[PDB]
């Protein structure tokens, strides 16, 4: 009995609907659905956007955020070091108080 | 007799240590099952409010574990939020303008 | 009603494949009136207790467990 | 002889019937099996989400 | 993780509420201990100058 590929899913139950055949239909349909949705659940569609919810796009976004914050911390250490050697450097927090009353921030 | 009593104490101690280990294990299991009991009781006593609370807490836990913060986006896209927080917005706008940040 | 799950847009911990019941219920809780839900679950509990009818009685049920306690 | 064909859309002769008519299990066994790394679902009998 | 596991046990198990049996309240160790101690308690000087 060669393979026949089973045309449209409800092919069987359209001829003498029984309990077992209907259960079989339900099972195979929900199996296909589960597989496809799991594949799209974690990965996503062919177009890849960092503003995706799937699993890989979420973690890609987290990695990019981490890299940005690491280089930001590098520049912050650069600012601290440069101001330690008595070379005035700008900071991500601003200058503070400028030369007036309340004196000058941006010293050691 | 002093030495004999010391010997018997040193012999009796290990079983007591083992039973203390077992007691701490059972106490931890009791804590976990009490957690579960409280969960199921909350759900059974008021199901709709419990399910809403569960959804909100799961989403907030994910947000916190990702290292995220900020306002809810759906709340701040609407115009009520800005006619209810009038005083806060006024003060902030003045502070931002007078400093040259706006 | 409300936006429901969509209200938490950037963070949505739902899985259609692995946890199929919770997503559907998240959509459904908006429609129902909660007071009738409380009434119905209380009716269910009372009817179950009445069916099994025909101190901690629910914990210690068999005769032997009470004597052991 | 049998074959485990394991592909939905190809025509078959029989299917392994899932666990539909259960038997009594105790609560502590459910507690033991409910953990991750031991919990298995069968999507053929669960609802679609 | 624990809330995920609890809700999975609650909603994703295909066991009717009747077929869930009750578990024991006394392990056999405590039963043996209680019987032994019941036996031993069933078997059970005014300052002389």
């Amino acid at each position: 009995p060669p393979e026949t590929k089973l045309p449209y899913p409800t092919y069987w139950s359209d001829k003498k609907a029984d309990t077992d055949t209907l259960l079989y239909e339900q099972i195979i349909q929900r199996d296909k659905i589960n597989k496809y949705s799991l594949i799209r659940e974690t990965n996503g569609y062919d177009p890849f956007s960092i503003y995706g919810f799937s699993n890989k796009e979420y973690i890609s976004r987290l990695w990019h955020t981490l890299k940005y914050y690491q280089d930001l911390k590098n520049t912050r250490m650069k600012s601290i070091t440069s101001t330690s050697q008595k070379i005035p450097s700008a900071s991500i927090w601003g200058n503070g108080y400028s030369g007036y009353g309340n004196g000058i921030t941006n010293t050691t | 007799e002093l030495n004999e009593n010391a010997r018997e104490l040193e012999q009796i101690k290990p079983k007591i240590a083992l039973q203390d280990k077992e007691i701490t294990s059972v106490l931890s299991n009791l804590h976990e099952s009490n957690k579960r009991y409280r969960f199921f009781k909350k759900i059974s006593e008021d199901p709709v409010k419990a399910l809403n609370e569960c959804i909100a807490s799961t989403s907030n836990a994910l947000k916190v574990l990702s290292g995220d913060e900020g306002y809810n986006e759906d709340m701040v896209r609407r115009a009520n939020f800005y006619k209810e927080n009038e005083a806060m917005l006024r003060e902030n706008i003045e502070v931002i303008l007078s400093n040259g940040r706006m | 009603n409300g936006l429901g799950p969509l209200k938490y847009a950037p963070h949505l911990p739902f899985s259609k494949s692995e946890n199929p019941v919770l997503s559907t219920i998240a959509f459904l809780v908006g429609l129902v009136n909660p007071k009738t839900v409380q009434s119905m679950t209380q009716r269910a509990i009372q009817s179950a207790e009445s069916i099994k009818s025909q101190y901690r009685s629910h914990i210690f049920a068999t005769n032997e467990e009470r004597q052991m306690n | 002889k049998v074959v485990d064909i394991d592909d939905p859309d190809m025509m078959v002769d029989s299917f392994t019937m899932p666990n539909i008519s259960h038997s009594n299990i105790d609560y502590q066994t459910l507690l033991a099996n409910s953990d991750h790394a031991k919990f298995t679902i069968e999507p053929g009998v669960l609802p679609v989400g | 993780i624990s809330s995920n596991d609890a809700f999975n046990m609650l909603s994703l198990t295909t066991v009717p509420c009747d077929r869930i049996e009750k578990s024991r309240l006394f392990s056999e160790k405590t039963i043996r201990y209680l019987m032994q101690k019941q036996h031993e308690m069933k078997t059970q000087k005014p300052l002389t100058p």
């Binding site: 009995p1 659940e41 973690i59 | - | - | 002769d13 679902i41 | 995920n4």
Partner: peptide, 28 residues
């Protein structure tokens, strides 16, 4: 003759709520 049997799908849970929170928690 041989019978062709289709056996339904039994899976273990892959993610926790659509995500794996161990890696997310590390990076966070």
């Amino acid at each position: 003759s041989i019978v062709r049997n289709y056996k339904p799908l039994i899976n273990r849970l892959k993610h926790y709520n659509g995500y794996d929170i161990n890696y997310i928690s590390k990076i966070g």
